Amino acid sequence: VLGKPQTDPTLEWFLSHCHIHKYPSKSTLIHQGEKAETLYYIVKGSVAVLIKDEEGKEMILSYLNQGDFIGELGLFEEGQERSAWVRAKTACEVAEISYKKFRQLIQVNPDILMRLSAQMARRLQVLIEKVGNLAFLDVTGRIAQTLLNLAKQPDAMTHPDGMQIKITRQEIGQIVGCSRETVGRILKMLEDQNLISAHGKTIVVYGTR
């Protein structure tokens, strides 16, 4: 009752240690930090990492796709996230595994951490990914970085005009410091062929800006 794909000897050897869970579009995989001691790995599909303050501001930290680990932040913090919700953007297959199980793998075979750490080591530095560019400025500054991140991720297919994303003032704003209210205001400019062809649900970005 099994049979999954693979690419590397360590990616498959470890994949058998976790429980690959299939999550459809808009299917939250993590809730703040319900785990607080479990590592995740998007075996397929794509998801989004949301964050909330002590008031519940809610903000899309960044986007993740197949081959991306989640909750690993706790492996060097405390639990697993406890402040990084995970909302799947499309039919994905993220696997989960208790630290007590993962920590054993990284120690049994020095490679699982080299591939996982490499993701986080560039996840907050990737720049323009909405993770290491949010420090710049919210509305009138972040709204742009977002549209760019999607164009950098495999989620946004390469169109003959730009990219094929499944977001807009509705989701975009969430990634920024405001909502579609103030965010959409700036989108009205680009959407009008002044920076980016944002047709709403589908944002056509000319290869990241």
DSSP calls for 35-87: -SSEEEEE-SSEEEEEE--TT---EEEEEEETTEEESGGGGGSSSS-SS-EEE
User: 111-145: string of b/e by CB count within 10 Å (b at 16+)?
Assistant: bbbeebeebbeebeebebbbbbbbeeebbeebbbb
Taking a C-beta distance cutoff of 8 angstroms, is the pair 46, 90 a contact?
A: yes
Continuous H helices in 86-141: 99-108, 112-123
3-state secondary structure of 30: strand
Task: Give the CATH number, domain containing residue 19.
Answer: 2.60.120.10
Contacts for 186-194: CB closer than 8 Å, 24+ residues apart:
186/139, 186/140, 186/143, 187/143, 190/147
CA 40 to chain centre: 12
The span from the CA of 63 to the CA of 150, in Å, is 8
The span from the CA of 83 to the CA of 90, in Å, is 22
**Residue 78 CB coordination number (10 Å):** 12
2 is a domain residue:
no
CA 78 to chain centre: 20
Question: What range defines the domain where residue 155 resides?
Answer: 138-206
57 is a domain residue:
yes
Which of these, 16, 129, 29, lies nearest to 70 by C-alpha position?
29
Q: Which of 103, 137, 171 is the last residue of a domain?
A: 137
44 is a domain residue:
yes
The total of structural domains in the chain comes to 2
